[PDB]
Swiss-Prot record, chain B:
Record-annotated disulphide pairs: none
Parent-record interval covered: 443 to 726 of 744
Name this polypeptide is given: Protein zyg-11 homolog B
Segments crossing the lipid bilayer: none
Function (record text): Serves as substrate adapter subunit in the E3 ubiquitin ligase complex ZYG11B-CUL2-Elongin BC. Acts to target substrates bearing N-terminal degrons for proteasomal degradation with the first four residues of substrates being the key recognition elements. Prefers Nt-Gly but also has the capacity to recognize Nt-Ser, -Ala and -Cys. Involved in the clearance of proteolytic fragments generated by caspase cleavage during apoptosis since N-terminal glycine degrons are strongly enriched at caspase cleavage sites.
Consequence the record notes for mutating residue 81 to A: Complete loss of N-degron binding
Source species, domain of life: Eukaryota
Amino acid sequence: GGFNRFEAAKLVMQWLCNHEDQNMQRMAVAIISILAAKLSTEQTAQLGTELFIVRQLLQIVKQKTNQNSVDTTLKFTLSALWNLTDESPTTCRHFIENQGLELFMRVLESFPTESSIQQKVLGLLNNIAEVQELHSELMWKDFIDHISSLLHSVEVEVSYFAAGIIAHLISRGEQAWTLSRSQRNSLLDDLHSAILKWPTPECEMVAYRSFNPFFPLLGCFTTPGVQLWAVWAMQHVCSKNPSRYCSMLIEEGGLQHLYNIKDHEHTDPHVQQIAVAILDSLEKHI
Amino acid sequence: GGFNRFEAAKLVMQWLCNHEDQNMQRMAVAIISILAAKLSTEQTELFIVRQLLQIVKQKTNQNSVDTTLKFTLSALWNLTDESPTTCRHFIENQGLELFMRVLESFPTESSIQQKVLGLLNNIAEVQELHSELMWKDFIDHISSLLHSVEVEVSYFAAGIIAHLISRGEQAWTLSRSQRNSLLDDLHSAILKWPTPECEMVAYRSFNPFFPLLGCFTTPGVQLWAVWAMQHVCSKNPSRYCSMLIEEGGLQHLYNIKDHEHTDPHVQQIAVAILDSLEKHI
């Protein structure tokens, strides 16, 4: 026997990241980014665990945050972290276990004017928010206050992700809300208010591999804010790229969840309007 | 969720190809040339091709023959290998005009000319882009490069001419008199070539050569194809002899050897390859 199939890649990766020549660090981040973007969600989870890529990227985020840099390396480091945590609870837990949450609050606090950095940070945290085992770790009052403030950002590609975090946290019910119930109730109201003011974004703000994490949100009839965010999200990606997303919605079972909303008697009007809109475009997908 | 993976990949490539740090740009373009050569073909990137063409343009505007330009031309050369779609994308983005401008700017840089002609040899292989190569200035420039005393330059100019001539006389829409001169010059020029010191090229497949092998009425075309087979078979026998055989090269070469009125120089080289393929026991 000898050491495992991944140790060579692991020690080259580390040599690149810690090199005096900053071009080697740019190399590693470019490599990680392109593999995060071409490989499948299970290869990236495998490789992410074996090379400890979450820990490696988080230490570049820290260095960049200490230097108050905001360069292209930091942007691709964060978008890699975002893409690796996509549909990957094991990667989301590596982030939490490496002080990712404290570090990302540092990032949001140090760069409050850099909306594309905030987008990448809140998109990652939106993925943590989808993992129920990780819900305890996000109930940190400083974090809820900060993202409750980002919820009212005028940039939709920032507030969209703040709203996603809030929507998932509220959707687990008071049983799991460890702060005051009044803040959760008022967050729920702000969630619903904020979403109704959103312009149609010009670009796609986000890409999804699966609609699964949205389906528990669609059944939350006693928290319309949570439902509204889910159906607004679906409406946004489906309307912007129906080839990829409409077929994905149907195949994963979206139709029962949408008809359940339409048919449900007492339904928030805004939730109902967007649901039937999604249903009717899905219907022309004959 | 995450960011659009296709757009992330392009943004990374844009960041490294166009980077202000020139050591980083040179590295990126070096890595892209290696990966294009080692990955499998097609499954297309046309975005990289536009980025690389931009760098060629800049290096021509600044009139600098440097390693970055050579790596960049190597990258395009390797991206067009057996990739008709990438070739077409090259044509559609003014590539023929930009390369003419490189040939005219660096008429003494053989390193540059080889990489340029290597890529154009790849377009010449694509029957559907043939009419894109019937350009008088272009055929005029490479027809004189056919006679360069550097075989790593003339070898690829010969290949362009061989493929274009192979398509027959109706397909040739420039002056028929030139085509006729080119026919004789192709055969005459090849007989003068010394043995190259190094491998000039790598091939994933012999398939583009097989049509040339049956051009008995245009023996310069056949002579280019067999001289090329002989060259890579002799330098890299472990790769090319086995590839020739497995793709049916003994049949194509015996058809030449057993053809009655074969140009003697074509016959000479076909039997050498045939013998060398067979000592490859």
